[PDB]
């Protein structure tokens, strides 16, 4: 579930170290941190944090057996106010308007709460009631004219991360990262915003590359880790399985070095050995997809946009130039290719 390889993107200083100084690869995913550009600005948010969570508060109003509309709202004014209404017996049919029951917006058409019947419809002047179970009880608003549909955003302060031409994630007034990474686009009453992987909705411009949130936005979960935290154990143990076999024998082999490759992009460290001196270098790692994009021609290793040079036919992370000029990558010649040249070496002072 990891990238088949991780080729570096920018190597640098090559300094000498010994065995006692060997670290296993932080194989932890790190969010996009290249976006150091901190540009402050003002951005929109949903007033309540989340797409799912928003509500026009509301009431109910009963009937006689059907209720009437003009008074059921005029009854909502009194219950909050001029108090004009404040045996088994008979059905004594008159009205009452109990409240303190609200609702939530569902993102396509927004009128859903326990409402004996699933959903209702729209509540502009076209229809001034949302019938519910039976006929006895009728309406469910706060203000008679759509007050919440378009009047539920806010503005704020913050810093917009970015690299050069790509636009990066937010830093909030609460000091934290909220990234547009793998998000999706939502249009809210005209303004073009983005739902993040968290239900928090922003009104950021069309980032240079996104796709519309599907109608999979109702419970905010639907398509909604763990399996990855398992493999992290069983890989960064081969690192120490190998780090032990290098520490308890003073003898490295090019196979064992590959296990120290940072298996996921980001700022980690890169290792190789020329003869007897083990040496370290920092590198931002880049994901590899298939072997064809880094070994195109005889002896070549694509390092950004170049061919990395053969230094005695060894190249980093245990990649060596073999009998002919095939660049043989350890993990790649583990495609049913048995190759023996990479097994004996030593370490000193």
């Amino acid at each position: 579930k990891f990238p088949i390889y991780t080729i570096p993107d920018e190597l640098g200083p090559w300094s000498p170290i010994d065995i006692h100084h060997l670290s296993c690869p932080n194989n932890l995913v790190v969010e996009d941190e290249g976006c150091t550009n901190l540009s402050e600005f003002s951005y929109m948010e949903l007033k309540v944090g989340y797409i799912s969570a928003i509500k026009v508060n509301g009431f109910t109003c009963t009937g006689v057996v059907r209720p009437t509309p003009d008074a059921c709202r005029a009854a909502y004014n009194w219950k909050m106010a001029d108090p004009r209404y404040e045996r088994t017996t008979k059905e004594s049919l008159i009205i009452i308007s109990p409240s303190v029951t609200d609702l939530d917006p569902y993102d396509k058409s927004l009128h859903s709460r326990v409402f004996p019947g699933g959903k209702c419809s729209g509540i502009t002047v076209s229809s001034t009631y949302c019938s519910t179970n039976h006929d006895y009880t009728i309406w469910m608003p706060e203000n008679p004219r759509p007050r919440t549909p378009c009047d539920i955003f806010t503005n704020s302060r913050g810093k917009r991360a970015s690299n050069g031409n790509k636009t990066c994630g937010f830093v909030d007034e609460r000091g934290l990262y909220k990234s547009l990474k793998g998000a999706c686009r939502l249009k809210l009453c005209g303004v073009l915003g983005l739902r993040l992987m968290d239900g928090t909705w922003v009104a950021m411009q069309t980032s240079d590359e996104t796709k519309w949130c599907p109608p999979d936005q109702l419970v905010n979960l639907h398509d909604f880790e763990h399996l990855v935290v398992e493999e992290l154990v069983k890989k960064r143990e081969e690192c120490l399985d190998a780090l032990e076999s290098i520490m308890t024998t003073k003898s490295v082999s090019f196979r064992r070095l590959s296990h120290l490759r940072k298996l996921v992009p980001g700022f980690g460290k890169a290792y190789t050995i020329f003869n007897k001196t083990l040496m370290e270098a920092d590198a931002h790692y880049k994901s590899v997809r298939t072997w064809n994009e880094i070994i195109p021609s005889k002896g070549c290793l694509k390092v950004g946009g170049r061919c990395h040079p053969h230094v005695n036919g060894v190249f980093f992370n245990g990649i060596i130039l073999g009998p002919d000029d095939h660049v043989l990558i350890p993990e790649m010649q583990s495609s049913l290719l048995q190759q023996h040249m990479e097994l004996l070496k030593s370490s000193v002072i």
Partner: single-chain antibody
Amino acid sequence: SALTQPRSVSGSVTISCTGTSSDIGGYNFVSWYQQHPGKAPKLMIYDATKRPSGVPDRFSGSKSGNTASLTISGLAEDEADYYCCSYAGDYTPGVVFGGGTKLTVQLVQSGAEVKKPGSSVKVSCKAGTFNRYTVNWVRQAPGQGLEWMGGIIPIFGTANYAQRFQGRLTITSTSTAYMELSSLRSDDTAVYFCARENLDNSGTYYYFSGWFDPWGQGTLVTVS
């Protein structure tokens, strides 16, 4: 093909605008505009059937969900092209326009400018009603139809640009608006106007719905 208009109608005469689009919840805001030559379009119909609140003379506004309509009252000075403009709610960001109906019977800008290579051009648009307001910018290529490019809600400091012009456009106390292009490439050579929308309630409010009534005018830019 976005909307639909008869290329021209001869003559009471009527123009249709099939393509009234109501989004996923129920909102529809066809808003018409008339274009005299070299003159900026004036708002003649908003919210399907309503007349412009200041000075209106022709009186017709119709809509049948799948069709909007416009029935002129008089039968010589009406002579012009006519365009419609509605909202759209799922995948599209702003407003759309028609394709020309040759009917047969205040603000400022930056001014006339030219550029040789695809480098930048910057327009100004001086002017406050104080209500909900979304300033925008529109493009008409030489003798073709209208084309919304992007918007800006100055209060929240957020801007919506369109898809064909994303990234190349950058729309932004003095009653002053602006507009910037990142690469002129000759296919964008056109005339550029500034306009906005100012209303309170959701009945005829969607941000960038088509209620462009404060209208600017006059940025004719040339690329080489």
